[PDB]
Design a protein around this motif. Structure first.
Motif, PDB file in Angstrom:
ATOM      1  N   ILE D   9      -7.784 -39.278   9.439  1.00 49.56           N
ATOM      2  CA  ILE D   9      -6.974 -38.373  10.244  1.00 49.56           C
ATOM      3  C   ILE D   9      -7.789 -37.769  11.371  1.00 49.56           C
ATOM      4  O   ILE D   9      -7.250 -37.019  12.194  1.00 49.56           O
ATOM      5  CB  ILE D   9      -6.356 -37.352   9.274  1.00 49.56           C
ATOM      6  N   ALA D  11      -8.757 -39.683  13.697  1.00 54.18           N
ATOM      7  CA  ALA D  11      -8.093 -40.340  14.812  1.00 54.18           C
ATOM      8  C   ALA D  11      -6.764 -39.692  15.155  1.00 54.18           C
ATOM      9  O   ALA D  11      -6.192 -40.014  16.200  1.00 54.18           O
ATOM     10  CB  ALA D  11      -7.880 -41.821  14.509  1.00 54.18           C
ATOM     11  N   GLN D  12      -6.255 -38.806  14.302  1.00 50.63           N
ATOM     12  CA  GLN D  12      -5.135 -37.949  14.649  1.00 50.63           C
ATOM     13  C   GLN D  12      -5.594 -36.688  15.361  1.00 50.63           C
ATOM     14  O   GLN D  12      -4.956 -36.246  16.322  1.00 50.63           O
ATOM     15  CB  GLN D  12      -4.332 -37.587  13.393  1.00 50.63           C
ATOM     16  N   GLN D  13      -6.700 -36.099  14.920  1.00 51.57           N
ATOM     17  CA  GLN D  13      -7.242 -34.932  15.598  1.00 51.57           C
ATOM     18  C   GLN D  13      -8.755 -34.975  15.535  1.00 51.57           C
ATOM     19  O   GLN D  13      -9.336 -35.049  14.451  1.00 51.57           O
ATOM     20  CB  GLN D  13      -6.724 -33.635  14.981  1.00 51.57           C
ATOM     21  N   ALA D  14      -9.382 -34.954  16.695  1.00 53.70           N
ATOM     22  CA  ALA D  14     -10.826 -35.035  16.744  1.00 53.70           C
ATOM     23  C   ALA D  14     -11.439 -33.676  16.427  1.00 53.70           C
ATOM     24  O   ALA D  14     -11.010 -32.660  16.979  1.00 53.70           O
ATOM     25  CB  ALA D  14     -11.289 -35.503  18.116  1.00 53.70           C
ATOM     26  N   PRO D  15     -12.444 -33.631  15.554  1.00 49.04           N
ATOM     27  CA  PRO D  15     -13.072 -32.352  15.208  1.00 49.04           C
ATOM     28  C   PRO D  15     -13.778 -31.752  16.409  1.00 49.04           C
ATOM     29  O   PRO D  15     -14.705 -32.340  16.968  1.00 49.04           O
ATOM     30  CB  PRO D  15     -14.059 -32.733  14.101  1.00 49.04           C
ATOM     31  N   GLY D  16     -13.323 -30.578  16.804  1.00 48.30           N
ATOM     32  CA  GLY D  16     -13.835 -29.922  17.976  1.00 48.30           C
ATOM     33  C   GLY D  16     -12.857 -29.771  19.110  1.00 48.30           C
ATOM     34  O   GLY D  16     -13.218 -29.179  20.132  1.00 48.30           O
ATOM     35  N   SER D  17     -11.631 -30.261  18.966  1.00 49.09           N
ATOM     36  CA  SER D  17     -10.644 -30.118  20.019  1.00 49.09           C
ATOM     37  C   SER D  17      -9.387 -29.482  19.468  1.00 49.09           C
ATOM     38  O   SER D  17      -9.251 -29.270  18.262  1.00 49.09           O
ATOM     39  CB  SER D  17     -10.265 -31.451  20.656  1.00 49.09           C
ATOM     40  N   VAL D  19      -6.427 -30.880  20.869  1.00 48.17           N
ATOM     41  CA  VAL D  19      -5.437 -31.896  21.176  1.00 48.17           C
ATOM     42  C   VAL D  19      -5.067 -32.635  19.904  1.00 48.17           C
ATOM     43  O   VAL D  19      -5.935 -33.145  19.190  1.00 48.17           O
ATOM     44  CB  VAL D  19      -5.964 -32.873  22.226  1.00 48.17           C
ATOM     45  N   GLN D  20      -3.779 -32.695  19.618  1.00 47.66           N
ATOM     46  CA  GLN D  20      -3.274 -33.681  18.676  1.00 47.66           C
ATOM     47  C   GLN D  20      -3.269 -35.024  19.397  1.00 47.66           C
ATOM     48  O   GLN D  20      -2.629 -35.181  20.441  1.00 47.66           O
ATOM     49  CB  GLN D  20      -1.894 -33.272  18.155  1.00 47.66           C
ATOM     50  N   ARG D  21      -4.044 -35.975  18.903  1.00 48.56           N
ATOM     51  CA  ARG D  21      -3.986 -37.298  19.496  1.00 48.56           C
ATOM     52  C   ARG D  21      -2.724 -37.989  19.017  1.00 48.56           C
ATOM     53  O   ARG D  21      -2.449 -38.035  17.818  1.00 48.56           O
ATOM     54  CB  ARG D  21      -5.217 -38.117  19.133  1.00 48.56           C
TER      55      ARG D  21
END
Lengths: 60, 102, 479, 445, 359, 331
Positions: D9, D11-17, D19-21
């Motif tokens: 997950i 790739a769903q949300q990068a740690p540190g942002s 933004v929902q990818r």
RNA sequence: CUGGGGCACGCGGGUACGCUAGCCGC
RNA sequence: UUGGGCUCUGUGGGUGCUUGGCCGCUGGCCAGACCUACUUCAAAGCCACCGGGGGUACCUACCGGUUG
């Protein structure tokens, strides 16, 4: 579900996630939660017998 | 090699180092003999239990020595070899059981 | 030539995303229509071309296993070896939940993959959120449960009870009993058209709304207690299987069945259908299971045998399937390739879950993790098969991991796009095509020896004097 | 060779942002219901633009004491309008300060027939008493004019030069006469050389400058030139014409507003057929104005109805009214081609909108995405019965709707009598003339 | 709630995060900074600061260049532990534990704990290697770095041996030695695990004085408490309890008695077996066996203390003679009677001398 | 935000060249997989609302090294069809969003200008320098780089435009005044090398306005003398040296900088028999400056710095070097 | 000037560099 | 009787009369193995649970018709 905005509610007046027109404002839920019945089955058994007696009154 | 040192440095830079990173992570003669085993042979494809022990789909009649070798392979595949299968004073006292008497 | 790759790209894009054969441009007579349609087909072609160009951006890979040596066959691969093989991510996802003392467990997965729902026929319903391993609802429901399924998200689910059909909300509460669909033994959810489909023992079939709550169509499917049910999620139609062993394919917009294919001579035990929209495999009471194309209505190859008439079948996202039969289930890989115009029989299957006295109740796939849920009379479990499931999704359609914000966003989007249930057909995308009879009436109002014997024999019983019959009588006299 | 699909997950949300990818896939295998889904989106599109179909935007000023029988926009500034009354008074508003007035004076005795602005700053008034010229934006105000004329009879209308200081006055003596500012007194008197019948209006072309067209009461139009000082051509049609215009992009394209209750799109080179017939009214049209886009058109009836138009329908895209406005007279666009002006009989200047459901401003990116998405979807499906009827269903005042039923019934009977005469006459052995061919009676040089 | 307990067991066994809030929480559980910044921290500047600390640490000590190669790389940026298979994870775990034993000496310092921060915030070490990390910071039980580690551990991940800190993780406060050792008394397995760690440290030659001093205090008070209960009064019960005790302490005490490279752990083994002798009424054969392994294992820096141990051992012996090789090595002892007078100045060596002259 | 859809646009922009690279054997499936994933992560963190020009430069150097590595592998693989143009354009888009996002990072400005000056975007570089110079009107570094690359290309008139505008704006520091006189006399030396300009009165005039400039310092005039004393191989160099000397002698009479230039004046074009004679003349000037009543510690620090420089110049006599050592130690 | 069309854009040795302007190949 | 108590948790048994764990079983297996064959003929009807009074524009069904 969120609360609709203006256009959303206006378009889906007939939408409702909770109560349908097949629910009678939850008369079943009303009865059972006033009087602690345990089988809504049994509520409906009371309703069917009550409707039978009422229609016998109607022919009377 | 046909690849420059600076070129491979770029490859490690942009592309990634997954494979070499995985690499960095992953850094008695027999006394007695028998002749009956050489005399013996067995039908592997006929044998249902022994069927799955072949190497090719051609090995049916196999001599006894090779048969017992495939038995060894089957047995080690079943159970891998243990480390005890691979003095000191209190170690000797420790293995002494006369040290434990009531 | 170097443009051979270009032309192959054109062919593959026009096969994939072209959405139709193509428009003829030279048959056009008019110049304005011709140059404008030229620009149209131009932009359409650029569109499909850049669709192929965009098709590279998938993140994940496709799951698989390949037998290495000659003796090695895929259905001799054991599951603990798969555990030692692959990553701790999915190793946290293969497990088994032994519920023992409440009968054969029926399971189903959420449409997004977030949740799963379990029912024991003798009383139990629990919905649980498996990946974080946490449960939100569990209630023992006492009365015997005949079926279970989620609704459009993890907010609600729906259950076939001992007389009525119920819809519950997520924290255990019963939203409403429904007494309109008495004695359901099969329940499905048309998911885009927002419709419960209820099949009862009597042969009554009711399409009921959920978002505004009217049943839109009840139908007396006159023939047979429906032994089995599933639904096509490409036409969104109803594949139901009858006791005569015939399968009938249904739609809410005429009382007649819309197709009636024939299958094994006794009652077809189970059905399953493609999600891309291509084929449908059934298993009959006669021990054979076999496939059919749907767009062409035909068996492809000879009927496969099963060593017991299979109680269930769940076909995957891709061409894989699990077929569940008695005490152990089996998985095949390539039972219908899309590209092959004719198909093959396959000698050996892909992989099985084996028979240790764990009689299957049914099987389902998670739609978005390469796992396999087996409902058996000793509980639920899930093993892994790497080829299973789609590999790269569109969160625009569905996300396995939506937030609260995207969840409510999606519910409002789906409510905005609920599809009026008249538009059901064998042909899925037929909208805006012409009415032949009406267009003939329009054009008409714009521009304005051997059959005559049956004509007289049919009209000799009317008995209108019929000046057209006077012309017919004079012509028969001249004959 | 075991290997499975493995999504973290991350790739769903990068740690540190934050933004929902949101990765997409484009498989038809994943996105069904394409056609009926967009159709539904089009339905909701139409229903929401008729939630938001809110035309009105205001009433300026106080309204003139009697009704507006003259008004004119400045076309080179952006927010200055003269409106002149029936009661022989004029004033000018600024758009921005909506409420109050910029400058007010009486102008004549009779009803002021015409009004405009000079290309520099001054403004102009025709009425039957004569032609006058004031300057509104003087730093102390004066009420007296600074230019005048009384010769040429009753002056029916004005027409001013796009760029230079030319203007023309249409009189009712069958004569037009042109002045140049600062260098002329009585101007050049041009007419059809043997003609008396009156000239209602005249619009200077702004595509090809130094060109003039005017209407005459012989149910007839005349095209003129200024280089070669002479009329050019005279077309005679079935019934009269009320006000002229030429298109501010398509130079040969002109349009006339006609007591046929009809807007006719003609083309100067070829008067053989009407290019378009706009058969859109019950009462006779009082005014026309081309949008500066050249793609839109106001047709302002005598009756209680504005109708708004593209160049290429032949029918009603929009009807507008409200009952406070009995009889619209002067109906002209602003310089954004978004906002129209509406000078009434009821003494009012109204500020309305075209494409009546577009809420202007500065949108967000996804907003204009959705709006033009609605546009495209409606464009694709603009024929089906459901969306079609919810599209064409406006609301309409009672006498007007009764009268358009009357018109349809009477003209249907007229066409019935015509076709019966054709089928049972010797006209059967002839070609059926099309209606835009039929549109012209005769043409004359 | 049967299925609820079963799913709860699974939720314990869950490792990689699967919903957005849980991802954020385990992402933000850190060491140096506060969670409010940690959530808006991404790997890059994290890699920057920890790499600065790592270069400081590799400049202090040479032996950090292997993890400069394998665990502190630009690829060690991207590698997420959750996505690979169990043997890869096993090799990675071995690399971890080797670095932990490598880093255990320089614990109280900022660049080293920056490295620790990279360990957590990249490799989830607090979740995946709870036991070895917990043991390797355990001897620092009065410092706030250890306090913060206790703050951000996961509770169901703390080892069954290690679940004693639960009052302190409810109430953040550095637990004291009395608590750890009381658990060592009436919890043998804590001692077992800490023994295993510290013997691995000396076997990998990365022992250090703070470690061994801690471990000396731990074993000494531990086995002291162990006898302090194990004395029961019942005859065969005390014999059998001493048996079970010996089975528990066997491997570690032998490895530390003849741990030839590490004199400190030799001294600590001397300590534990000396208390084992003097307090517990052990049998003469077991006592002489202790004597024999000590004889086998001493050195010359450890010489005089080992002499003190033999004074204890023979002084609490009951028979009057010594068994052979002990006398052989005491002939090998260089300064016998001088050292013996020096020790008998405070230690009563008489039974030792008597067993000597008998032999 | 809307980062998912904006990044969808940008990754769809990145698609077709990677399709070309996959139909080529230059990069394989897993490599291009890694590449697209990295680019997506990059562009996401780029378009994040909370943002920083350092990470902007990270993505910048990442795409730049991409173009480099692909060029190197293409040359190793002997391929000719593939170009670098799409990589240049997407690099430009990264930079363009970067500069619209942060108008405050001069370092990132210079990074953009260096990337452009390397890849040969001439008119583009000129216009970008124009924009950023309008944005930061208070960096003589920027003004000097502008006029310097213009003087390097040979558009001396446009060099004068940039430099003259910079002199009109920046008026707190004499540094760009120093560099402008430097490039003006350097252009004059270029004229003498290709051999009004025969007079060369422009550094005279810029000194005349510098005399009443707000930063008007005696040490500033000393630095003016120093930059004028650089490249003394000209025609009117003695003229301008005499002029600046008499100007500061007229204005700052007893300043230690005036005494320092009175020492170091006749060594304009020295480096040979003319070296030690002028050395002795300037040494007499230096002894006069030492005995005169000025700030002796200030003048001695000036002369010890200049004498350390003289000692850094090799090729001298040991007696001269030792008497410099003595006169240095005696301060 | 995203008005439209035409020329060139890589690696070698050269003529030539605190640089790249010109010849032919790869 | 050389310590003991309350209270809670965990395991196994039994809370019913002692005949195998599994399978595609007149047989095989538990280390299993083999894996996709073969084919003469769709089906007989009926039943089938919704609370009462009330309305029927539209839909469904039944009945009785009507053009083709």
């Amino acid at each position: 579900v969120r609360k609709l905005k203006y256009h959303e509610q206006k378009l889906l007046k007939k939408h409702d996630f909770i109560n349908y027109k097949s629910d009678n404002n939850h008369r079943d839920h009303d009865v059972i939660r006033r009087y602690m019945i345990q089988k809504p089955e049994d509520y409906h058994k009371y309703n069917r017998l009550c409707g039978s007696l009422r229609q016998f009154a109607h022919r009377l | 090699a046909e690849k420059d040192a600076e070129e491979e440095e770029l490859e490690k830079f942009v592309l990634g180092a997954k494979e070499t990173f995985r690499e960095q992570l992953f850094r008695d003669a027999p006394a007695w003999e028998d002749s009956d085993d050489e005399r013996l042979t067995i039908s592997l494809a006929g044998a249902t239990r022994l069927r799955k022990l072949r190497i090719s789909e051609s090995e049916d009649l196999v001599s006894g020595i090779e048969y017992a070798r495939r038995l060894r392979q089957q047995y080690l595949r079943l159970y891998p070899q243990p480390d005890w299968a691979k003095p000191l004073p209190l170690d000797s006292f420790l293995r002494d059981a006369n040290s434990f008497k009531v | 030539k170097a443009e051979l790759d270009r032309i192959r790209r054109y062919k593959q894009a026009q096969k994939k995303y072209g959405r139709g054969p193509r428009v003829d441009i030279k048959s056009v007579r008019d110049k304005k229509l011709r140059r404008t349609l030229t620009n149209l087909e131009n932009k359409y072609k650029t569109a499909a071309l850049k669709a192929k160009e965009a098709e590279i951006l998938l993140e994940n890979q496709t799951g698989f296993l390949e037998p290495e040596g000659e003796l090695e066959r895929t259905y001799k691969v054991r599951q603990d070896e798969i555990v030692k093989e692959v990553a701790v991510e999915v190793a946290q996802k293969k497990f088994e939940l032994k519920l023992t003392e409440l009968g054969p467990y029926t399971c189903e997965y959420s449409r997004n993959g977030r949740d799963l729902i379990l029912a024991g026929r003798k009383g139990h319903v629990a919905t649980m959120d498996w990946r974080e391993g946490k449960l939100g609802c569990e209630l023992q429901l006492g009365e015997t449960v005949r079926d279970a399924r989620f609704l459009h998200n993890n907010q609600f689910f729906a259950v076939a009870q001992k007389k009525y059909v119920y819809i519950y909300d997520h924290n255990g509460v019963e939203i409403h009993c429904l007494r309109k669909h008495v004695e359901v033994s099969h329940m499905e959810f048309l998911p885009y058209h927002f419709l419960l489909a209820t099949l009862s023992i009597s042969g009554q079939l009711k399409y009921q709304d959920t978002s505004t709550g009217q049943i839109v169509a009840e139908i007396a499917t006159k023939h047979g207690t429906p032994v089995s049910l599933t639904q096509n999620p490409y036409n969104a139609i109803l594949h139901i299987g009858q006791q005569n062993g015939t399968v009938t394919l249904w739609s809410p917009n005429s009382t007649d069945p819309l197709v009636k294919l024939l299958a094994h001579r006794g009652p077809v035990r189970s059905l399953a259908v493609d999600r891309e929209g291509r084929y449908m495999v059934s298993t009959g009471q006669d021990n054979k299971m076999c496939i059919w194309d749907i767009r062409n209505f035909k068996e492809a190859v000879n009927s496969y045998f099963t060593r017991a008439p299979a109680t269930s079948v769940a076909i995957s996202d891709t061409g894989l399937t699990a077929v569940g039969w008695g005490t152990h289930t089996t998985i095949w890989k390539g039972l219908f390739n899309k590209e092959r115009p004719v198909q093959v029989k396959v000698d050996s299957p892909y992989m099985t879950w084996g028979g240790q006295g764990q009689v299957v109740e049914r099987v389902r796939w998670c739609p978005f993790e390469d796992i396999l849920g087996i409902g058996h009379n000793e509980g639920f479990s899930s093993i892994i098969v790497p080829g299973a499931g789609e590999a790269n999704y569109d969160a625009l359609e569905v996300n396995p991991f939506e937030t609260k914000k995207q969840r409510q966003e999606g519910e409002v989007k789906a409510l905005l796009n609920k599809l009026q249930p008249e538009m059901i057909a064998l042909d899925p995308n037929f909208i805006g095509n012409l009415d032949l009879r009406s267009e003939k009436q329009r054009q008409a109002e714009r521009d304005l020896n051997t059959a005559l014997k049956k004509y007289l024999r049919k009209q000799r019983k009317k008995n209108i004097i019929d000046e057209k019959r006077l012309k017919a009588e004079e012509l028969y006299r001249q004959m | 060779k075991i290997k499975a699909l493995t999504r973290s997950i991350t790739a769903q949300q990068a740690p540190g942002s934050d933004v929902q990818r949101a990765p997409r896939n484009l498989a038809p295998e994943l996105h069904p219901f394409e056609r009926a889904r967009e159709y539904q989106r089009a339905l909701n599109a139409v229903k929401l633009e008729r939630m938001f179909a809110k035309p009105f935007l205001g009433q300026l000023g106080n309204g003139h004491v009697q009704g507006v029988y003259s008004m004119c926009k400045d076309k080179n500034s952006l927010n200055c309008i003269a409106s002149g009354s029936g009661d022989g008074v004029v004033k000018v508003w600024d758009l921005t300060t909506r409420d109050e007035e910029t400058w007010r004076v009486a102008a004549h005795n009779n009803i002021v027939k015409g009004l405009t602005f000079t290309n520099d700053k001054k403004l102009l008034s025709c009425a039957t008493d004569g032609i006058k010229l004031w300057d509104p934006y003087a730093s102390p105000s004066n009420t007296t004019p600074i230019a005048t004329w009384q010769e040429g009879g009753p002056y029916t209308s004005l027409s001013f030069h796009r760029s230079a200081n030319t203007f023309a006055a249409s009189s009712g003596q069958g004569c037009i006469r042109i002045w140049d500012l600062e260098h002329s007194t009585a101007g050049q008197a041009i007419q059809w050389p043997s003609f008396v019948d009156t000239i209602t209006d005249v619009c200077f072309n702004q595509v090809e400058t130094s060109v003039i067209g005017s209407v005459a009461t012989d149910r007839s139009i005349i095209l003129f030139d200024l280089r070669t000082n002479m009329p050019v051509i005279k077309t005679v049609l079935h019934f009269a014409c009320n006000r002229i215009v030429f298109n501010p992009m398509e130079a040969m394209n002109l349009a006339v507003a006609s007591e046929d209750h009809n807007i006719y799109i003609f083309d100067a080179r070829n008067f053989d057929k009407a290019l378009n017939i706009q058969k859109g009214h019950v009462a006779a049209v009082m005014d026309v104005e081309f949008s500066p886009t050249g793609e839109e058109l106001v047709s302002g009836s005598y009756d209680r109805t504005i109708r708004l138009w593209r160049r290429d329908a032949g029918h009603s895209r929009d009807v507008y009214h409200t009952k406070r406005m009995q009889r619209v007279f002067r109906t002209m666009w602003t310089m954004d081609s978004k906002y129209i002006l509406t000078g009434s009989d009821d003494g009012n200047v109204r500020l309305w909108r075209a494409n009546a459901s577009e809420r202007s401003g500065v949108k967000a990116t996804r907003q204009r995405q959705a709006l033009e998405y609605n546009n495209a979807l409606l464009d694709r499906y603009g024929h089906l019965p459901e969306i079609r009827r919810i599209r064409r269903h406006r609301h309409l005042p009672k006498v007007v709707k009764k009268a358009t039923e009357i018109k349809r019934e009477e003209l249907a009977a007229i066409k019935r009598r015509e076709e019966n005469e054709r089928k049972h006459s010797n006209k059967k052995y002839e070609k059926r003339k099309s209606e835009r061919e039929k549109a012209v009676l005769v043409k004359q040089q | 709630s049967s299925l609820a307990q079963q799913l709860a067991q699974i939720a314990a066994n869950s490792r990689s995060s699967f919903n957005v809030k849980a991802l954020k929480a385990s992402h933000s559980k850190s060491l140096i900074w506060e969670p409010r910044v940690a959530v808006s921290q991404t790997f890059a500047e994290i890699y920057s600061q920890c790499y600065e600390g790592f270069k400081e640490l590799c400049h202090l000590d040479s032996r950090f260049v292997p993890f400069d190669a394998t665990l502190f790389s630009a690829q060690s940026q991207e590698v997420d532990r959750t996505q690979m298979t169990a043997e890869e994870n096993a090799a990675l775990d071995k690399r971890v534990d080797s670095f932990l034993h490598l880093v255990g000496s320089r614990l109280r310092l900022m660049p080293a704990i920056k490295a620790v921060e990279w360990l957590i915030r990249r490799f989830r070490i607090h979740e995946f290697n709870t036991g070895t990390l917990l043991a390797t910071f355990l001897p620092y039980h009065t410092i706030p770095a250890f306090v913060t580690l206790l703050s951000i551990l996961p509770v169901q991940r703390i080892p069954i041996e290690y679940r004693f800190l639960d009052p302190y993780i409810k109430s953040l406060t550095p637990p004291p030695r009395a608590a750890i050792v009381q658990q060592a008394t009436n919890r043998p397995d804590l001692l077992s695990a800490i023994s295993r760690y510290t013997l691995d440290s000396c076997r990998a030659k990365q022992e250090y004085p703070g470690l061994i001093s801690f471990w000396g205090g731990i074993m000494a008070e531990a086995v002291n408490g162990m006898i302090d209960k194990m004395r029961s009064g019942r005859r065969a019960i005390q014999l059998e309890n001493d048996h079970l005790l010996l089975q528990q302490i066997g491997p570690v005490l032998s490895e530390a008695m003849v741990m030839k490279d590490v004199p400190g752990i030799q001294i600590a083994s001397y300590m534990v077996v000396a208390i084992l002798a003097a307090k517990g009424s052990l049998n003469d054969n077991i006592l002489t066996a202790f004597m024999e392994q000590l004889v086998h294992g001493w050195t010359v820096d450890t010489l005089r203390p080992g002499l003190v141990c033999l004074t204890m051992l023979a002084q609490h012996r009951s028979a009057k003679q010594l068994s052979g090789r002990v006398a052989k090595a005491v002939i090998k002892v260089p300064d016998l009677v001088s050292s013996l007078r020096d020790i008998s100045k405070e230690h009563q060596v008489d039974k030792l001398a008597n067993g000597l002259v008998l032999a | 935000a809307w980062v998912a859809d904006k990044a969808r646009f940008y990754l769809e922009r990145a698609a077709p060249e990677l399709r070309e690279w996959e139909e080529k054997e230059i990069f394989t499936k897993d490599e291009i997989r890694n590449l697209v994933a990295k680019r997506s992560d990059f562009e996401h963190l780029v378009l994040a609302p909370g943002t920083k020009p350092t990470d902007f430069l990270n993505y910048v150097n990442w795409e730049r090294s991409l173009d480099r590595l692909r060029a190197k592998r293409c040359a190793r693989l002997n391929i000719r069809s593939v170009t670098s143009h799409a990589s240049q354009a997407r690099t430009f888009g990264i930079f363009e969003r970067a500069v619209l996002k942060h108008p405050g990072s001069i370092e990132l400005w210079l990074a953009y200008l260096e990337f452009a000056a390397q890849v040969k975007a001439t008119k583009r570089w000129r216009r970008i320098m124009t924009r950023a110079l309008r944005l930061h009107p208070m960096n003589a570094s920027l003004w000097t780089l502008a006029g310097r690359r213009a003087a390097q290309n040979g558009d001396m008139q446009r060099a004068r435009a940039h430099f003259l505008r910079g002199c009109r704006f920046c008026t707190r520091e004499p540094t760009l005044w120093l560099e402008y006189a430097r490039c003006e006399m350097d252009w004059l030396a270029r004229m003498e090398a290709k051999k009004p300009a025969l007079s060369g009165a422009i550094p005279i005039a810029v000194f005349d306005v510098a005399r009443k400039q707000p930063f008007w310092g005696p040490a500033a005039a000393e630095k003016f003398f120093d930059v004028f004393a650089k490249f003394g191989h000209l025609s009117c160099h003695e003229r301008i040296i005499s002029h600046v000397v008499t100007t500061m002698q007229e204005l700052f009479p007893n300043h230690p900088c005036t005494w320092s230039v009175h020492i170091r004046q006749p060594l304009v074009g020295v480096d040979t028999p003319a070296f030690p004679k002028a050395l002795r003349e300037s040494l007499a000037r230096l002894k006069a400056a030492l005995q005169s009543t000025t700030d002796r510690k200030a003048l001695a620090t000036k002369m010890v710095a200049w004498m350390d420089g003289i000692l850094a110049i090799e090729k001298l006599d040991a007696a001269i070097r030792t008497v410099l050592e003595h006169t240095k130690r005696s301060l």
